[PDB]
Amino acid sequence: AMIIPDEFRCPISLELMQDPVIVSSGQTYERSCIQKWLDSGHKTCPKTQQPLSHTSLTPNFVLKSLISQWCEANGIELP
Amino acid sequence: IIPDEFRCPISLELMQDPVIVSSGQTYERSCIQKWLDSGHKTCPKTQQPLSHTSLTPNFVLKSLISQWCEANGIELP
Amino acid sequence: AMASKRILKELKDLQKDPPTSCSAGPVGEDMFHWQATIMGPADSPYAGGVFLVSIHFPPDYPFKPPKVAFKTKVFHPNINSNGSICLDILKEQWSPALTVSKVLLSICSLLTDPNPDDPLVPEIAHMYKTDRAKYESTARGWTQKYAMG
Amino acid sequence: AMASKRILKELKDLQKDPPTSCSAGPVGEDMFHWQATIMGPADSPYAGGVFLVSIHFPPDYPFKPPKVAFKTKVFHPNINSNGSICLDILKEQWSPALTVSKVLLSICSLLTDPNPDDPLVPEIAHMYKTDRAKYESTARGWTQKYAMG
Numbered sequence: 001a002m003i004i005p006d007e008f009r010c011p012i013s014l015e016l017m018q019d020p021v022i023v024s025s026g027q028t029y030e031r032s033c034i035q036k037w038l039d040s041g042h043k044t045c046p047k048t049q050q051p052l053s054h055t056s057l058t059p060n061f062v063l064k065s066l067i068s069q070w071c072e073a074n075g076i077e078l079p
Numbered sequence: 080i081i082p083d084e085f086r087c088p089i090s091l092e093l094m095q096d097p098v099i100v101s102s103g104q105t106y107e108r109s110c111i112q113k114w115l116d117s118g119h120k121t122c123p124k125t126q127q128p129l130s131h132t133s134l135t136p137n138f139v140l141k142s143l144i145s146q147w148c149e150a151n152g153i154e155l156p
Numbered sequence: 157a158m159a160s161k162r163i164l165k166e167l168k169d170l171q172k173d174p175p176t177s178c179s180a181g182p183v184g185e186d187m188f189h190w191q192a193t194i195m196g197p198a199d200s201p202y203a204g205g206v207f208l209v210s211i212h213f214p215p216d217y218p219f220k221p222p223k224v225a226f227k228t229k230v231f232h233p234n235i236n237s238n239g240s241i242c243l244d245i246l247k248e249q250w251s252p253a254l255t256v257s258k259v260l261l262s263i264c265s266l267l268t269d270p271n272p273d274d275p276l277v278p279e280i281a282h283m284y285k286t287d288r289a290k291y292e293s294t295a296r297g298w299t300q301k302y303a304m305g
Numbered sequence: 306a307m308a309s310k311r312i313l314k315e316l317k318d319l320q321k322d323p324p325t326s327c328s329a330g331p332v333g334e335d336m337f338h339w340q341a342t343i344m345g346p347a348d349s350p351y352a353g354g355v356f357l358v359s360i361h362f363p364p365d366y367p368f369k370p371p372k373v374a375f376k377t378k379v380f381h382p383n384i385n386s387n388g389s390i391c392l393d394i395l396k397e398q399w400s401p402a403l404t405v406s407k408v409l410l411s412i413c414s415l416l417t418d419p420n421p422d423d424p425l426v427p428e429i430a431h432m433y434k435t436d437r438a439k440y441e442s443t444a445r446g447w448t449q450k451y452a453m454g
Contacts, residue, residue, distance in 0.1 A: 007139050011402035012367065013307075014314045022099055026136035036368060037401050046402035056131070059103040062084050063139055088253040089218060090158070091165040113219060114252050123253035 001074035008067050011047050012037070017067065018078055020060040024053040028060050085144050088124045089114070094144065095156040097137040101130045105137050159217045163187060170257055178260045180211065188213045192260055196303065197268040201295035202230070205303030209263070210239070211256060221250035224259055231291070231298040233270045233281040241266070242276040308366040312336055315404050327409040329360070337362040340376075341409060345452065346417045350444035351379070354452035358412070359388075360405060370399035373408060380440070380447040382419050382430035390415075391425040 010017050012033035019031040025045040034057065037046060044051045071078050087094045087107035096108040102122035111123075111134065120129050148155050167187060170180060180192035190211035196202030208227040214220035224246055226239035234242040245254060245262050275281030283291045313336065319329060329341030339360035345351030356379065361372035373395055374388035383391040394403060394411050424430035432440045 005143075007143055012311075014311055014318065020139075022135055022137065022139075024133070024135055026138045028139045033401065040368065044400075046400040049398060049400055054133075056101070058099060058101055058135065060099065060137065060139065061103045062097075062105045062137070066082075066084055066143065089162075091162055091169070110252065117219060121251070123251040126249065126251055 001076070005070070008063075008070065016076075016078070017063075020063045020067070021057040022060045023055075023057065025050055028063060031057060082147070084140070085147065093148075093153075093156045094140070097140045097144070098134040099137045100134065101132075102127060105140060108134060108136075159213060159215065160188075162218055163213055166255055170255070175257045175260045177264055178257075180256060180260065190256065192256070194260060194264060194267075196299060197264055199268050201292045202267050202299050202303070205299040207267075207303055209260070218252045218254075221246050222256065222259065224263070229298060229302040230267075231280060231295045232267065232277070233272045233284050234266055234274065234276050236276050240276065242271070242274055308362065308364060309336060311367055312362055315406075318404070319406055324406045324409045324413075326413055329358075329405060329409060337366075339405065341405070343409065343412060343416075345448060346413055349417045350441040351416050351448050351452065354448040355454070356452055358409075360408075367401045367403070370395050371405065371408070373412075378447065378451040379416075380429060380444040381416065382421055382424045382426055382433050383415060385425045389425060391420075391423060 004016055008016050010020075010030040010033055011027065013030055015030070017028075017030045020028050021031045021034065022028045023034060023045060025048050027045055027047045029046070034046070038052075038055060043055065067078065070076075081093055085093050087097075087110055088104070089110035090107045092107075094105070094107045097105050098108045098111065099105050100111060100122055102125055104122050104124050106123075114123060115132050120132060121127060122129055145155055147153075164187065167182065167190075174180075177195040177197065178192060180190055183189040183191050190213075192209040192211055194207045194209060196205035196207065206228070207230065210223075210225040210227055212223040214222065224241055224243075226235055226241065229237070241263065243259070243262055243266060245259055270284060272281040272284045280291070283294070316331065316336075323329075326344040326346060327341060329339055332338045332340050339362075341358040341360055343356045343358060345354030345356065356375060356377040359372075359374050359376055363369035363371065373390060375384055375390065376388055378386065385391075390412065392411055392415055394408060419430075419433065421430040421433050429440065432443070
């Protein structure tokens, strides 16, 4: 409960994700954080440093669900 | 008991190469590909049209599966 | 092969959480062949009826839809004498992700609320539109003959 | 404000699994300034060396790379006498997903395998490509002069 699985944390914010989205490279970030990076004119994946083969941010629903089950089952709220 | 998130809506087995469609739903790569190849352009689980027919790997779920398998002494998918 | 595990896993899950008014299982040991039994919905002129349904699995299942046929006779606008069912799930709105359970639930939904505008039996469809009370009555009597006994 | 949160949480991560040959942490309670210690790698001509390093975080961290410099004098073809480190991660190939930990690790990979192809002190790169034994020796002497102790 007190150790958040690394997979639920945003590579950019280092924070537990509320709205996980996935970019064409297959990595997942919080929506706001990856947006700020793209809006600054970088069209590359922060984690793989490979250039992003598109910009659509599709939601990672299965991940959002798993984060909710982990949150409910340990007592954490998801601000 | 396999967590239901780790299973493919089409194959119903534990996923080996989980990929995501534009709807935001995750599937085993070979199955979802087969359906798109068949010519259908809809997400099978939500039955809505897909904006684009592109398969992006879901590496986070891949990791969470590989870990659960090592945790529960199961063969990696 | 792929179809074989999928059916096997679909049967296990179906017998864990069975559908609301329904029972299904393999025909003996050919688990590519299934029998389902559906109870007549209560809102329906089919209440108190037991309807038997046949289930055969195509080769490319779950990518081709399954073959679903009544064995019990029913007065219905969308089920003919050969037991064929006019259901969109079964023809065109099929998905690799739907299940036998879903199809059975949709069949119960049809039995409650027939879809006369896509008829398979036009006389029955016509009766439903123009003389509903005769439709309801004739269905009670067919249910009594072939389902309740 | 987001930058401060991301720094404090990156600090906690380093404390749990600190980087390999390196120790780092804040200067007092000013949280946007860090000093860090690197042990000279074994294979390198900096072995047995202790090198100090300042880390200064931008206001828009992590979206803007941190400022990182040697405060200990070194004989390296990609480090200059004012401490400036020429490494791509700190300038052009920075990413919002890199951490101080990953930077320190790169500085270690640098001391061990330097890049002659892009110098910041061409003299030392000239020596590294002309007379490596002149370099290793000059390095070990600078190490003992300024870094051992």
